[PDB]
From a paper:
Co-evolution between cereals and pathogenic grass powdery mildew fungi is exemplified by sequence diversification of an allelic series of barley resistance genes encoding Mildew Locus A (MLA) nucleotide-binding leucine-rich repeat (NLR) immunoreceptors with an N-terminal coiled-coil domain (CNLs). The Bh avirulence effectors AVRA1, AVRA6, AVRA7, AVRA9, AVRA10, [name], and AVRA22 have been characterised and are recognised by the matching MLA receptors, MLA1, MLA6, MLA7, MLA9, MLA10, [name] and MLA22, respectively. For both barley MLA and wheat Pm2a, co-expression of matching receptor–avirulence pairs is necessary and sufficient to induce cell death in heterologous Nicotiana benthamiana.
In contrast to the pentameric wheat Sr35 resistosome bound to AvrSr35 of Puccinia graminis f sp tritici (Pgt), we find that the [name]–[name]-1 heterocomplex is purified as a stable heterodimer and resolved using cryo-EM at a global resolution of 3.8 Å. We observed that the substitutions MLA13K98E/K100E, located in the CC domain, impede effector-triggered receptor-mediated cell death, therefore allowing us to express and purify these proteins without triggering cell death-mediated protein losses. In line with the SEC results, negative stain transmission electron microscopy (TEM) analysis revealed homogeneous particles with a diameter of approximately 10 nm, suggesting a 1:1 heterodimer of [name] K98E/K100E –[name]-1 rather than multimeric resistosome assemblies. More peripheral regions such as the CC, the NBD and the first and last blades of the LRR show resolutions above 5.5 Å, implying their flexibility in the purified state of the heterodimer. The overall architecture of the MLA13K98E/K100E–[name]-1 heterodimer resembles a single effector-bound protomer of the pentameric Sr35 resistosome. [name]-1 adopts an [name]-like fold in planta reminiscent of the crystal structures reported for E. coli-expressed AVRA6, AVRA7-1, AVRA10 and AVRA22 of Bh, all of which share a structural core of two β-sheets and a central α-helix. The higher local resolution of the cryo-EM Coulomb potential map of the interface between the [name] LRR and [name]-1 reveals interactions of the effector with multiple receptor residues, specifically from the concave side of the LRR and the WHD (4A and EV3).
Residue numbers in the entry:
A (entry chain A): 2 to 131, 143 to 541, 555 to 956
B (entry chain B): 25 to 122
The structure:
């Protein structure tokens, strides 16, 4: 948990300080020697005491609430001071004061454990207790996960749109006295049964029989001002501007619109219980016309208060069968074969009767069994079993299903608990980029620095995959099948928020501030619309800029985020960066998207930064002439900014692992490029070109043995030079784990063939290859590219083409998701039957051919009974090359005929580049030339 | 003279040139880090076809990288829309030049 996590990282930290700094001072080292032994004993003792819950430690837990948690901060306040400031100010006497508190804590551990009844594990501690950037790829996202979520979203559709019973209870069958009375029916269900989708079917299919209609969500806002404003928009029709209104007058406000009007409104996604009565009061008593009010809710007890009157009815979605539920469960664990555990298999299914077999509870328990492989005997049958309530009809509220999500939370291994809790600072249903989140975990320090000298980013990536693995965060895929964003489930957000506000880990401001002081310590604040010197993490979203204090009043701050905000050089907040000097502890200064005028001259005085993200700033032109003390930074992103690097300012920056967006002038590419031995990703832009510049770039790149991503581009309009690509292919050899290669410069595939037969370890990690200026694509070139075992995205263009045809072999391209071969007028493309097993999108061009078949034939590609896995659009160009319009029109129809019996029905598009679209005369007598 | 959306503001006299230049370049010619190659054909309104091409926050042209804005238009500068991926989809209509 939090108490052990915050302290478990200081032991390696101060151990490194002894190795790096404290070895110089013999007197201090002896004092820190006492500090080291007590910390090793104390934190390990807390782990042993960690079996006992925090709240039972009245002496200790309240002491975090008073001293220890602040002691873990004031120590960290001087630990970060030890490196530079204490090295200059010599604040040794502070250590004597603190070690006394730990000595009392050591005495407390001897006493508190003895008094509370815990085993005396202080003297028992002596008896019982006692280079490479890639440490270990812990896990990748399970391939079976993508298909499992696909079926679940498709399964909810079938189990939706079954409102035959729902229509029966609507009482809208004919004419009756009961039909003339008000009948407000409420529907309730679990979190995932899919009643929200179903409620639309009645709304759409009943439009004709009803004069007016309405549908507006409520969300997780327990307020009446928002819902009344939303309701009045579409009562039966728009009613002009009614923003300035009161809740009390809503009785009259709805009176002037529906005093005797047949009203049909639907309110969905509500967590409020008394709202039903309030609108009912505004709807008066039962009328004599006949109207229906349908409301859905995920909380039965809330809906019970909403639906507790005579005539009203409750309708809930059934559990997902007993046979169809096994499909969503047996796929995640045993993809191929299993006949060993069936009694435990079946009895674990019946456990879900507490919810009945709802989709959310099935995935959360199932995936906890297998993280990367199968597991030992479960033993879960003795903990949760059946005795945990019975929510078929009465415990289905936040009494039983909450416990199921709570059980999986406590089985997460150690450090993942603190990482998951941090996601509370984001709003509902937000988009969380993978790169931004991981680079923030490192800044605060939630990744244990294991193996002493490995990249923190890779270890952080391992944590994110494991969270994706079980159930905690839902992936959002992209082209070539990768997870570049994540989402949090609705109910899981509730569990995180309640657990976070109990331990006061993160404070969320609703928009008016929180009265937290003294005992209610403010530690990490998230802002979504004195005595605050103890804050150490502030985050602002681009809707609450108007409410923020100046930057001067901060002294221990660590993380400052202003992404997408309006800091810039506009508005009326006086938000100039001047005054950033008194912030000599920062670890994350993210000015992601503000219109920054000039970087402050004192920015270099903060010799502790690790990440600096200027993701987009058009008017930024120069870095300050003081960036030479930053020897602890890993991130530097400069894309979207036209900045010229100063001379001799980049050499002593020897901590980089990623650099995105720079230029080259004379020798910066050689004098101060090979020294950075820790660089892993490189993104560069070239302005001019000559042999005295490319030679320097190639020589430096040979000394970077730990590079895995490379991107090269050109800025000048003229690109007649072929020098850069040919020089790179003759000397440089790729490393063992090279991943990405993107280039827009003119290139040749003879150079790529050279790298293949030079590397001792053949290219087995190059997952992408983007080339937009290739000249020649020969038959021997396609086979070599098709033999790579990890390629996932290819895009090659062609110019000055001189070959007549190309074929894609059946035994070849294997893990390809995107194919973008678009050679010119020549090179008729003929796909080998039954190829590209996993392709999801293709683009292919064809031309006039001729001289290929003796007789006049319709233009035929290979597409009949081929590409059995297409999902998204398919694109085929068309080139005339001085041909007949009738032939071109035939080519358009011929291609569309083949992809019509495809048993997936993907969309098909076409585009005629020479723009044949004209007055449309068939006997056009040739159209144009290649231009 | 602006168009407001989820979190940004784009000056009106720049969306027009993006809607026009996208009908002179080739189709599926500019690759992207995510999503795919652009411009992409869209659904049909009042006949003809539509195209989509990304735009940047300030309003300049987009060459490569990542984007969260898009412009969809027809080949008359009559039906024009602004698209925002961001947190959630949000669509606004664009008036026509006169």
């Amino acid at each position: 948990d939090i108490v052990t996590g915050a302290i478990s990282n200081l032991i390696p930290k101060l151990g490194e300080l002894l190795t790096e700094e404290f070895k110089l001072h013999k007197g201090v080292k002896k004092n820190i020697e006492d500090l080291g032994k007590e910390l090793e004993s104390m934190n390990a003792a807390l782990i042993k005491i960690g079996e006992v819950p925090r709240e039972q430690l009245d002496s200790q837990d309240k002491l975090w609430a008073d001293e220890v948690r602040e002691l873990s901060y004031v120590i960290e306040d001087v630990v970060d001071k030890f490196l530079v400031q204490v090295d200059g100010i010599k604040s040794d006497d502070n250590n004597n004061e603190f070690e006394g508190l730990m000595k009392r804590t050591t005495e407390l551990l001897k006493k508190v454990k003895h008094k509370h009844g815990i085993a005396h594990a202080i003297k028992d501690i002596q008896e019982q207790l006692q280079f490479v950037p890639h440490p270990t790829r812990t896990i990748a996202i399970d391939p079976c996960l993508r298909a499992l979520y696909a079926e679940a979203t498709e399964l909810v559709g079938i189990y939706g749109k079954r409102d035959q019973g729902l229509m029966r209870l609507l009482s809208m069958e004919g004419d009756d006295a009961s039909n003339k009375r008000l009948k407000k029916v409420s529907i309730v269900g679990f979190g995932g049964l899919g009643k929200t989708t179903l409620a639309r079917a009645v709304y759409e299919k009943i439009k004709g029989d009803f004069d007016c209609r309405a549908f507006v969500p409520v969300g997780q806002n327990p307020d009446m001002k928002k819902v009344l404003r939303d309701i009045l928009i579409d009562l039966g029709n728009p009613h002009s501007d009614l923003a300035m209104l009161d809740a009390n007058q809503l009785i009259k406000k709805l009176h002037e619109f529906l005093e005797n009007k047949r009203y049909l409104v639907i309110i969905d996604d509500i967590w409020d219980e008394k709202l039903w009565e309030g609108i009912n009061f505004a709807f008066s008593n039962r009328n004599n016309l006949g109207s229906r009010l349908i409301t859905t809710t995920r909380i039965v007890s809330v809906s019970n208060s909403c639906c507790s009157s005579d005539g009203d009815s409750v309708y809930q979605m059934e559990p997902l069968s007993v046979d169809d539920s096994r499909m969503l469960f047996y796929k995640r664990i045993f993809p191929d074969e299993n006949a060993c555990i069936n009694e435990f298999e079946q009895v674990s299914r019946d456990i879900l009767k507490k919810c009945g077999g709802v989709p959310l509870a099935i995935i959360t328990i199932a995936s906890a069994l297998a993280g990367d492989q199968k597991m030992k005997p479960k033993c879960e049958w003795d903990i949760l079993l059946r005795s945990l309530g019975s929510g078929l009809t009465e415990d289905n509220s936040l009494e039983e299903m909450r416990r199921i999500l709570s059980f999986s939370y406590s089985n997460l291994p150690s450090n993942l608990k603190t990482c998951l809790l941090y996601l509370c600072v984001y709003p509902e249903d937000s988009m969380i980029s993978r790169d931004k989140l991981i680079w923030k975990w490192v800044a605060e320090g939630f990744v244990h620095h294991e193996n002493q000298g490995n990249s923190l980013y890779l270890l952080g990536l391992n944590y994110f995959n494991q969270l994706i693995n079980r159930s905690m965060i839902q992936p959002i895929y992209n082209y070539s099948g990768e997870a570049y964003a994540c989402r949090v489930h609705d109910m899981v957000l509730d569990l995180i928020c309640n657990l976070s506000n109990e331990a006061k880990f993160v404070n969320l401001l609703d928009g008016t501030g929180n009265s937290m002081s003294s005992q209610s310590n403010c530690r990490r604040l998230s802002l979504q619309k004195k005595s605050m010197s103890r804050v150490r993490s502030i985050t602002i979203f681009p809707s609450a800029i108007e409410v923020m204090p100046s930057l001067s009043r901060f002294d221990v701050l660590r993380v400052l985020d202003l992404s997408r905000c309006n800091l810039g050089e506009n508005s009326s907040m006086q938000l100039n960066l001047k005054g950033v000097g008194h912030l000599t502890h920062l670890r994350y200064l993210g000015l992601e998207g503000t219109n920054i005028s000039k970087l402050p001259a004192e920015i270099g005085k903060l010799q502790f930064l690790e990440v600096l993200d200027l993701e987009n700033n058009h008017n930024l032109k120069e870095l300050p002439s003081t960036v030479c003390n930053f020897r602890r930074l890993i991130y530097l992103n400069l894309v979207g900014c036209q900045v010229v690097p100063p001379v001799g300012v980049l050499q002593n920056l020897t901590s980089i692992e990623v650099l995105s967006g720079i230029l080259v002038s004379l020798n910066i590419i050689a004098q101060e490029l090979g020294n950075l031995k820790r660089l892993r990703e490189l993104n560069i832009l070239f302005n001019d070109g000559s042999l005295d510049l490319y030679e320097g770039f190639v020589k430096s790149l040979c000394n970077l043995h730990h590079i895995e991503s490379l991107i090269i581009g050109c800025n000048s309009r003229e690109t007649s030079s072929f020098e850069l690509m040919d020089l790179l292919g003759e000397r440089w050899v790729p490393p063992v784990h090279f991943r990405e290669f993107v280039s827009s410069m003119p290139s040749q595939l003879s150079a790529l063939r050279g790298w293949i037969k030079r590397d001792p370890s053949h290219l087995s990690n190059l997952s992408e290859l983007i080339l937009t200026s290739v000249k020649e694509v020969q038959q021997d070139d396609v086979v070599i590219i098709g033999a790579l075992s990890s390629l996932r995205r290819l895009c090659i263009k062609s110019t000055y083409q001189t070959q007549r045809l190309l074929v894609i072999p059946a035994d070849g391209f294997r893990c390809i998701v995107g194919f973008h071969l678009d050679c010119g007028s020549a090179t008729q493309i003929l796909f080998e039957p039954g190829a590209l097993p996993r392709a999801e999108s293709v683009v292919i061009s064809l031309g006039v051919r001729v001289a290929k078949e003796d007789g006049n034939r319709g233009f035929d590609l290979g597409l009949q009974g081929n590409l059995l896995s297409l999902r998204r659009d398919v694109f085929v160009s068309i080139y005339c090359g001085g041909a007949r319009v009738g032939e071109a029109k035939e080519a358009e129809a011929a291609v569309r005929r083949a992809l019509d019996a495809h048993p997936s029905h993907p969309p098909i598009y076409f585009e005629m580049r020479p723009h044949i679209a004209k007055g449309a005369h068939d006997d056009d007598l040739c159209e144009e030339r290649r231009r | 003279g602006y168009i407001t959306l989820g979190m940004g503001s784009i000056h009106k006299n720049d969306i027009y040139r993006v809607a026009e230049h996208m009908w002179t370049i080739d189709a599926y010619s500019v690759p992207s880090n995510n999503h795919g190659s652009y411009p992409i054909f869209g659904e049909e309104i009042n006949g003809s076809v539509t195209r989509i091409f990304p735009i940047v926050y300030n309003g300049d042209d987009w060459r490569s990288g990542d984007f969260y804005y898009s412009v969809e238009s027809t080949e008359d500068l009559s039906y024009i829309k602004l698209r925002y991926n961001g947190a959630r989809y949000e669509t606004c209509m664009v008036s026509s030049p006169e």
